[model samples]
Target: VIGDLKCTTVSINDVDTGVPSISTDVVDVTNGLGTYYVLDRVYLNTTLLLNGYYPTSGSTYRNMALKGTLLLSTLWFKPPFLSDFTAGIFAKVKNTKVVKSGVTYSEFPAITIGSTFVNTSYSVVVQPHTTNLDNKLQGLLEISVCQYTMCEYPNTICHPNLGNQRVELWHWDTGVVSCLYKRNFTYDVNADYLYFHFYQEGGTFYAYFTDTGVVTKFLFNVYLGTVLSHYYVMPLTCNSAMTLEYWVTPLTSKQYLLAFNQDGVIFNAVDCKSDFMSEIKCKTH
Candidate 1:
């Protein structure tokens, strides 16, 4: 579980409940989800992506983590009444020369090469690290990341110059640090009831499709890393019952990909990164 430990455990408190109410509390561990992370200490280069597939449900989940020094983005949140995971974890990064209109899949913003690398871009996503928990007492943790957009021109906006990009941070990207939470749930004795819980974060992003066929779908991509652990809890309709649990290796950078298109209707496309890359000139600020 050491690999699963991304945070340093800043602090924790003990709460004394006067009455059980036989009550169940589903808390996010920390309230005010956004104020938990600052760009300065957020993890960098240490990026991760994850994905979960359910054939019968006909749905899959994705996530990413791209954090670093070049970002002005961080999350600030008002406390949720019950669940808030301390803004999960946040990554940071800096700006590149690309503007909203100029970025697309045809060209990825150049960041670094094997030697003297420059003029490239990088993107990120946040996702769920934990799948499901136990029946009695359980915990979940969430995470977020900062992405770097590396390139030669640091300040190019529009088709030529990039500058004055505002500091707007929203919970977007499929799975950056968004994926690091543990949840606790309980079930009634002798009941075959099933419980399903899910959490989602959203944000505004740019979309890109290039003349080349390599589509870059989400501005920051989300890929599920591994399945650390999964719990069936109780088998469905089985009297020969047995408690079931399994530990899994986190999938790494294999589950997700970007499909660049305009009408995808998942994320609203805002052209900033590529638009600046097209006609980027050195004079841009």
Candidate 2:
């Protein structure tokens, strides 16, 4: 009857080991244990049953009986030495199941947004389209005048106003290009610069909360233009303030960047070009 039973092959680490040959009747794959039964890959529909010689037990008696179905492509039976999986794969499976949890319910860590967009160390490039002559003209025309007669006052009677040149005040506000080089602006809520506010209650996080008594939280990922995939309530310590700072980073590019605060209010935005002509003061809707 044993010779007539159908058979199947079992391999350990790719090498054939005649132990787990499938059969209709219970077979003693191994009479005893001292070696690991590594299953590099199971051919599917295979059955395994171990009695007496359990993987872990006293050598005097076969006290452990194990049974399972091999529905996976590859699996390792471990005693450490008998594991046929590569070291990298073995390291990945610290537990029986290959599942990991990221950002759990009670564990939210502080996150720092990298300064990839704003590099203060970047070399400032002045483009030709930038106003050079206007800057010099402003410097030349920087004059201050006062009207008071010394005959009735303490001055030289206002010098009789002899010069044909008219006094003029030139300001950089009229410059062709209005660029802020690595300028950092801080918005303080208490100071009326309520551009952004970060607050959290219970498990909710708010980026901008200017709405009266009701609570408002960050509504979107702003940058990604979609709902936030992962978010944790921001934690603020007592007496500590929340600050929002904006500047150009190394990754700053052609268009101005846009970001929102906890309340979904646009806090930072600017249109810039790489030509280095600096910022333009044109009206932008």
Candidate 3:
């Protein structure tokens, strides 16, 4: 926050446990910045038979669709209350099945010797400069699991459709203007069918739908966080019926604030002015 802050990057296994997710990463609006855990590729290697739902006896039976939507978020803290902030683009992959009449059917045309679907889904986010500083800092990679009990959608319980909707908003510091005003808005989704190729360059994170060449941009790194929580890592009081086998990687999340300035999104010209620095401890806080 002031001068140069001491930032260290260690493996998540060492600092893995911190607030059993589905929660917001609160940013004190006063200070000018923060870190992004860039989750390059969250590969889901799952057995189709183990997950999903069956209607029992129906004219047409359809298993619950596989919706892999990863989400990471940032919030503004007004002292005790972490009131508001913008959520980054969510990488969603819905493998909705074709309804078949009878007791059973297989969605996949064929399975390997291992009988599993080795898949790749999303990951985003973090901070930028002060005094209109033009500095492009970078971000990390990892997959997190969570529940949909807290989103705008109205649902009493979480029945995960395999890997449902992911809303990624990592610890990336996109500055106060972007957080409070919700600036630098860019979005794109995976085609209704499967398959996608995603890569990152510059400060912006890019995901291209191989079928349609469409892409979405989040100012800073936007690492995809999971939708299906609880069953994997028990944190919430209520858990989902389904389970998501997390696609792991050798990456870290417990990263301290970077030395340089964070990226600022200045798309729309709103009344952007002073906010608090005392809220967040510069280095040792």
Q: What is the lDDT for 74 in model 3? A: 13
Each candidate structure's count of clashing pairs: 79, 17, 44
Instruction: Return the top candidate by lDDT.
Output: 3
Candidate 3 residue-wise lDDT at 240: 23
Q: What TM-score would you give candidate 3 relative to the actual structure?
A: 0.19
The runs of at least 3 residues in candidate 1 whose Cα sits more than 4 Å from the true structure, single-residue gaps closed, are 1-186, 203-285
Stretches of model 3 off by over 4 angstroms after superposition: 1-194, 210-238, 245-285
Per-residue alpha-carbon lDDT of candidate 1 for residues 1-285, written as tens digits (9 for 90 to 100): 101112222211123333211112221111111011111233232221223110111112111111122221111000111112111111111111122343310101111111111112222222111122342222121222233222221211111112222221121234433222223222222222111221122322211111111121112223323111211110011111122111111112112211222433112111112234311421132
Please state the error at residue 204 of candidate 1 in Å: 15
Candidate with the larger lDDT of 1 and 2: 1
Minimal lDDT window, size 10, model 3 = 108-117
Residue 8 in model 1: lDDT:
22
Arrange candidates by TM-score, descending.
Answer: 3, 1, 2
Tell me each candidate's TM-score: 0.14, 0.12, 0.19
Ten-residue region with minimum lDDT total, candidate 1 = 105-114
lDDT for model 2, please: 0.18
